[PDB]
C-alpha cells in the first residue's frame, strides 16, 4: 500500500491521473519524482521549469554543479540528484526532443532508467515541448517499465484522450 490517490490503473504496474506533477509531488512526497529533463539539466521550461521553480531554483543551482563535474546526460540517459522539497530523489531522465531531431527510438531506452526505482511520480517521458505523441509515450511506458509508476498528465484534454484510446 501507498499514498497516491485518485489514480486510474491501466496495467498491473501503470497507474495514470490527470495531475499537476508539481502538486502531486508536494503532496505525496515520493521516494522519486522523474523530471523531463534535457542533457545540460537545464531547467527552463515544460515539466522541468514548473519542479524547478517549485524548489526556487535550488535544483538548477544541484545541476548546474553536477554538469560542471560530470558533463552532459546522455538522450536515453538519467542521473538521481536530490527531490528538494518535492521528493527524497528526483531521476531526471532525457528523453528524445523531436523538436532537435532526437532519435524515437531512444524513448524505450529513457523509460529503462525507471526500472531501477521500485515506485515513481512521473511524466509521460518525451510528451509537451518534447514534441512526441503522448499515445505513443504512454506505451512504450507500459511495454518497458517493470516497476510501479504513477503517471501525473497535466492537460484534462490529453488525459482523458491516453485513457479512452488505451488498449
Ligand atoms: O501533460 C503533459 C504530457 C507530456 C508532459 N506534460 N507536462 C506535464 N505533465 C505533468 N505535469 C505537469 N506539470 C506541468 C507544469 C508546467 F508548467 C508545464 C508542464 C507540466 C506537466
Do not use: W
Amino acid at each position: 500500500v501507498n499514498s497516491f490517490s485518485g489514480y486510474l490503473k491501466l496495467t498491473d504496474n501503470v497507474y495514470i491521473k490527470n495531475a499537476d506533477i508539481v502538486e502531486e509531488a508536494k503532496k505525496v512526497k515520493p521516494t522519486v519524482v522523474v523530471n523531463a529533463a534535457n542533457v545540460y539539466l537545464k531547467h527552463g521550461g515544460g515539466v522541468a521549469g514548473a519542479l524547478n521553480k517549485a524548489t526556487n531554483n535550488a535544483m538548477q543551482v544541484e545541476s548546474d554543479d553536477y554538469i560542471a563535474t560530470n558533463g552532459p546526460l546522455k538522450v536515453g540517459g538519467s542521473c538521481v540528484l536530490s527531490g528538494h522539497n518535492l521528493a527524497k530523489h528526483c531521476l531526471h531522465v532525457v528523453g528524445p526532443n523531436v523538436n532537435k531531431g532526437e532519435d524515437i527510438q531512444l524513448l524505450k531506452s529513457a523509460y529503462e532508467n525507471f526500472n531501477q526505482h521500485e515506485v515513481l511520480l512521473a511524466p509521460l517521458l518525451s510528451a509537451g515541448i518534447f514534441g512526441a505523441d503522448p499515445i505513443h509515450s504512454l506505451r512504450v511506458c507500459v511495454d518497458t517499465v517493470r516497476t510501479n509508476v504513477y503517471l501525473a498528465v497535466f492537460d484534462k484534454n490529453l488525459y482523458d484522450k491516453l485513457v479512452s484510446s488505451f488498449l
